[PDB]
Amino acid sequence: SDSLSFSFINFDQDERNVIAQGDARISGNNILQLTRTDSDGTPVRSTVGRILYSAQVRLWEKSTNRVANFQSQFSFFLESPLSNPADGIAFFIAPPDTAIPSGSAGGLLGLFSPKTAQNESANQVLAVEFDTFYAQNSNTWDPNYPHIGIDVNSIKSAKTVRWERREGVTLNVLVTYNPSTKTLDVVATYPDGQRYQISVVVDVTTVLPEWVRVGFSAASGEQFQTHNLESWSFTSTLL
Amino acid sequence: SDSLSFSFINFDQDERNVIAQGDARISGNNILQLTRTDSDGTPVRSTVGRILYSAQVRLWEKSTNRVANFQSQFSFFLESPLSNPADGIAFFIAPPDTAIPSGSAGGLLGLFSPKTAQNESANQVLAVEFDTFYAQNSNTWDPNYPHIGIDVNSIKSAKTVRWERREGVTLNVLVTYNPSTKTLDVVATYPDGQRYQISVVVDVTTVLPEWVRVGFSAASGEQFQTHNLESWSFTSTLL
């Protein structure tokens, strides 16, 4: 269609218009939990979950040279009982048939397969990652610190900014795409006003198909944490 | 979710987020055609078609006493080579599992079954009808003229206004529900400024389930016409 929007002030477990993949679920307490927990609510190793909004977004139209804008606002928090929590949460855009790739329960954030994770020609993923785990022994593509990144068909972010994950604290995020400037902008803020900004010039018509779904992905490998989405609103208009 | 909106400036045959029922289709020339035509494009007898937007609207929430507003704007035109064309087109709201009932290809507008069409206790349909056929020999519930009506769980409109269908002319329609006044308002206009207004007080929480789908229905029995939707935008916010 020419435009689509939705808003979740909170999520409820009855929500009809989201697609859960892997370990993702909306809890009975109204939190969207992307990764698995044991019966005590403790995060566990080797888990991946994603959610997609069910309606399919017209990101661009080849026969008319129309391109959509979009704006995605959301808030999340992460918790872990241990040091060096992993692996992170991402807002992402992918073809509507997208599924969790094998080998992605870890630093690939549920978004990529190991043999092609850095191969821009192979992937169909645009993502904004909140990447808490950076160890060189397995995340060779990361800078040596937790970071916010924009991922264009690769797990190696096109651009990153330094970000110190705060245990249990809500981060508020606004992601916007402007097709006239071909700019994808991210602004994230913690409650004290600390602000994180990352932006990339990217022509969405060369990185993604005409129809897409939007959503979130998270994963934990050998290190773990809960990945908790509290709210989400989205709008897209084909211009 | 807490809100949802979409817009079709035009329809395209590739549209991913609509559900076609019966004879409905979006043509290669970008018109949403609800009822069947022969190979020359001529309307035919005994046809019914409906479309639904795929995303499910939260019309109300019982555990929080929240009720949604909504606003639906659309335009349509009807064509027939013969006199007394039939049967009409309706915007409607129904449970998400809704399907064309048997016996509805005619004056029941694809919305009701003959034995219960006037039984408010049985149905789950809220509709705004543009009803072109009124013959007492089969449409006993209609006034003796073409009319615009608001249908609350019955094919006998709660309220009607006189309307002379114009062959091939676009009618523009705005339908709005205000939950604070429990008022469903319809305003329709022809290109010369002729205006049709109909409004009913109705508590949507007593006539429809908490989750619904929205869309359009049309049918032809022994008399026929094409039922052509040109554009449609919709918004709903749970208050």
Ligand SMILES: CO[C@H]1O[C@H](CO)[C@@H](O)[C@H](O[C@H]2O[C@H](CO)[C@@H](O)[C@H](O)[C@@H]2O)[C@@H]1O
């Ligand atoms: C504690 O294990 C760390 O070091 C191991 C090698 O000594 C790695 O195999 C291991 O990587 C896995 O877990 C990390 C952290 O969750 C994850 O990013 C990666 O994709 C693997 O699943 C880890 O770095």
Ligand SMILES: CO[C@H]1O[C@H](CO)[C@@H](O)[C@H](O[C@H]2O[C@H](CO)[C@@H](O)[C@H](O)[C@@H]2O)[C@@H]1O
């Ligand atoms: C030309 O047929 C008209 O009169 C018949 C009886 O003499 C009716 O059976 C017939 O009704 C069917 O067609 C109408 C018009 O399309 C429709 O409204 C009704 O639901 C029946 O399908 C028609 O009135």
Ligand SMILES: *[C@@H]1O[C@H](CO)[C@@H](O)[C@H](O)[C@H]1NC(C)=O
């Ligand atoms: C990257 O993926 C493309 C598409 O399959 C492939 O042609 C190319 O060989 C890959 N690059 C490498 C280094 O394997």
Ligand SMILES: *[C@@H]1O[C@H](CO)[C@@H](O)[C@H](O)[C@H]1NC(C)=O
């Ligand atoms: C109307 O439908 C209700 C619900 O099934 C039913 O109880 C009632 O008998 C019907 N009324 C008539 C007149 O048949």
Ligand SMILES: [Ca+2]
């Ligand atoms: Ca990482």
Ligand SMILES: [Ca+2]
């Ligand atoms: Ca009628």
Ligand SMILES: [Mn+2]
């Ligand atoms: Mn990273």
Ligand SMILES: [Mn+2]
């Ligand atoms: Mn009528």
